[PDB]
């Protein structure tokens, strides 16, 4: 609940930066608004990338640290060390 | 265009279904 919650909302912000203004340069907007145009499983699934090192995802750091903390307690739950 | 506008994004959809 309360991962979700944190990233809609910082979707919802990223997508209002996304879309004020590009005036110096325009090209780059089917690339930018591509994550918005994917839908929702897609979205999810590349919002949640942020295992290993690959780290093309858009999602913040603090938001990654969050569920990098629970997976680990949930690892250390089912008894995987 | 329209199609993927007239999508809405993840932050649009209920927070039950995004769960």
């Keep these: 609940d309360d991962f979700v919650a944190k990233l809609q909302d910082n979707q919802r912000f990223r997508y209002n930066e996304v879309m004020q203004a590009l005036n110096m340069s325009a090209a780059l907007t089917a690339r930018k608004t591509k994550e918005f145009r994917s839908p929702p499983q897609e979205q999810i699934n590349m919002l949640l990338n942020f295992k290993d090192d690959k780290s093309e995802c858009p999602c913040p750091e603090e938001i990654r640290d969050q569920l990098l903390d629970f997976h680990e307690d949930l690892m250390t739950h089912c008894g995987i060390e | ?19």
């Design chain 2, 1 to 19: 265009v329209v199609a993927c506008f007239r999508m809405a994004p993840l932050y649009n959809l209920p927070r039950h279904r995004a769960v």
